[PDB]
Design a protein around this ligand. Sequence first.
Ligand SMILES: [Cu+2]
Ligand SMILES: [Cu+2]
Lengths: 70, 246, 129, 70, 222, 52, 105
Amino acid sequence: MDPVLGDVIATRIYKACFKHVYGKNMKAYSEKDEAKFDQCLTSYVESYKSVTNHFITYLGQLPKKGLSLD
Amino acid sequence: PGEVLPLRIIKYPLGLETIHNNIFENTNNEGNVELFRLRFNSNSSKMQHKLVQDTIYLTLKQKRYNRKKVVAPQIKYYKKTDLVKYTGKPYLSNDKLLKQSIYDQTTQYKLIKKNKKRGELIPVTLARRILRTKKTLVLPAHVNITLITNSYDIVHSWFIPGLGIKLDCVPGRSTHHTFFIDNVGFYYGQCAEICGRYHHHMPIRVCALPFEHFLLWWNTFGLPKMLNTVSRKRFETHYELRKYSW
Amino acid sequence: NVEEMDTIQKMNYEATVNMGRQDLITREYTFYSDYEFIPIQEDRKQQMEDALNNLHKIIHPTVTQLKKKANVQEIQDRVFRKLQGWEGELNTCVFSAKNVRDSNFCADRFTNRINTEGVEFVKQILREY
Amino acid sequence: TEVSNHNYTQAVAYLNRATSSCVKKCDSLNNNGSLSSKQESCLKTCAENHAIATKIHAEYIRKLAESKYL
Amino acid sequence: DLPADYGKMPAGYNFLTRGKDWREYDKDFILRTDAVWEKFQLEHFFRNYMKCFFFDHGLKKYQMFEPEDMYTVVFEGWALDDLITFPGFTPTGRTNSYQIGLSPRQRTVVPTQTFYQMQDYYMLCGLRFERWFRCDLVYHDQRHTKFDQVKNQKNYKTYPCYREYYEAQYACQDDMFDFLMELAYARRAADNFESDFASHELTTLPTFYDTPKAAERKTYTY
Amino acid sequence: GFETVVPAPPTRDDELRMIKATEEQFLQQPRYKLYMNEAHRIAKMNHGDRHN
Amino acid sequence: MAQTAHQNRYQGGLCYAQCNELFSFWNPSIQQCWKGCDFGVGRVNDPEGRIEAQQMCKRWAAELYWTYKGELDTIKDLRVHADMYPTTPQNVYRACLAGVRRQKF
Ligand SMILES: [Cu+2]
Ligand SMILES: [Cu+2]
């Protein structure tokens, strides 16, 4: 892939963090908002890692050829 | 042709099993005797995998004995680690001892082939010219062995003269013939039917031995073969010697 | 697991997996000329299996108590003829079905037929035998 | 075997969409940086469901294309 | 006999025979006057007949080869082939000298007496193959889910067509079995049950075995 | 198909009674009617009488 | 009759004739009932003899065909049909029991 994919993912994560912080609470920005955004980013990274692991496993678990195992 | 019907109703066979006098073979998870079963077709366009050839027959290919080119030395490899763990050229001494051959075995074989003296009453057991074969059918004595005789191409005839038997293996005909050897011995025979080009040399060797000896041969060469496992002796052969006992 | 097995046991596990996974390989090759039929839904299969299980549960007392293989086979044959007529009607509706709505309707009709009239037929047969 | 960068990009986009769906469903953002036990279970379930859904949708698109061609 | 526990095994009976006086049993045995020559002849015969292995010196161990013709052993001893290690008669060292008999015959589903008059089992092989194919087609799909082909090895149930397949293989030969297997593969692809095409039942003469109340046909008596 | 209660295995007295009845039936056969001693002998004799 | 105790069925005796009456003319059950009657020689007249004869018949049936332990005891119908061919160990046991029961004196 290219870094543009990472940029798009970052933009999506930023939109998600804004929704999580200011989706229903439209207030002034502060260090509390920054910390909330950092926590949301950490949670998003963990969720992405878990989703990738589970999806790769389920897609890796689905049989596609006879088990050879050499 | 056509297609698989979406749903089919099948009645499971009744009375097929009499192991425990339980004529009800199929019982659902509810425990009720399952008399009818519904078989549904899933993929309309999918084909069907061919039935697995469940038959595994230990094949001994009895062919005519061939001339030896050069006497090779018995080379055993390490461990597949082709390094020669063991090397030698044995010779069966008069005491039936596989001692170390001190002469040139190739020279001995070549000289024997070049010139062998003959006698007016030389035993046929000591003079085999069109009766030597690679493998001999190893069987026990004083027992009933059924032989299913069959031909692959044309009707051949296996005639054991010492046993006085003559089985005509013909195509299509699975001739189930009994054999009871009331004595332990080794017998030689040839094709009693003109088989074509090799109607002269189609030797058959039959060795009937004590049941202990037949079992030993089976355990050392037959049990090891047709195992469908790793070819290691400690993995199959000993395993067979640890799995099967009479 | 596989790493916890010896050579023979690993070979046996591979044998079982391959023999069970044949259809997946058979999922590859298809013949175009065949008239494609929409498969019956898993819910419909489950409902039909439940109806068959109810029928088997009903049969269980008479089947277990009977001491005649001939009588068991006769009861099974009568029930099989009736259910075979019903299933033939259902399959005829299924083959010509053009939509999942038609598939569901045919499945519901077959299940109701097994539920309603087949029960009376089985009850009468059991009362006779 | 080898794979193409276009395939990698498609897989990355599918993973991003699945992660977004899982976060929105399981409310993964409402955490202090560590997913709860229920959050992780829901993440695994939703990731498996999304992988199955991606496979099914790809198969459906391919089958529509084939039926158009065939 | 006098003790009330005569014949009961003593507790912790080591069964060892160390330090046993052999004189007490001398009257319990009668030895032939030719016992010495008998022992010598028995030892010679046991050595000559049982020892079917050759003491190979290169590996300094017992060895064995496939049975060969006398001349092949006599005049062609310089070219022995396929020599392996003699593993021994028994893994535990027990003897193998016992008269053999016929094992209890396996159960029969398609009796050989149906066409036992014929020498070649052609019709018998055909009938056995038809029955085995019917049973297989009945239980083909559940072999991997409910039979010995299951993954849970502790849940392995013998296939319903086990005895049928064994009898069919016994009756039929290799080439005929292969041809019938191809034909049965075509039949399974067709999924054509014998009951889905049978109309020959109409054009057969009625028989006393085909009465309507078949259950009443049998007259069971003890 | 209604089933009946299976009678218990017979005692020696019942066996002797059955033997006596069978002996009487065997002796009852006329010498002129050549019918082989088989499980279907009685039905065959009845059919032969009907045919006569 | 190779397993029987008489040179000919005529030398078998009335019970053997009774055996010929038991089953159809196309079943080895005739030979099985002849063997069962041969097991009943001097055993039917005594109760212990009859019990031992039943046990011996079970033993012979087990030696005939490979049978599991207890299956011969799980037999529900000791009654036999004239069309019962000797195909199963249960059938062998039933035929032997019938032959023993059909032996007089
Ligand atoms: Cu030939
Ligand atoms: Cu020839």
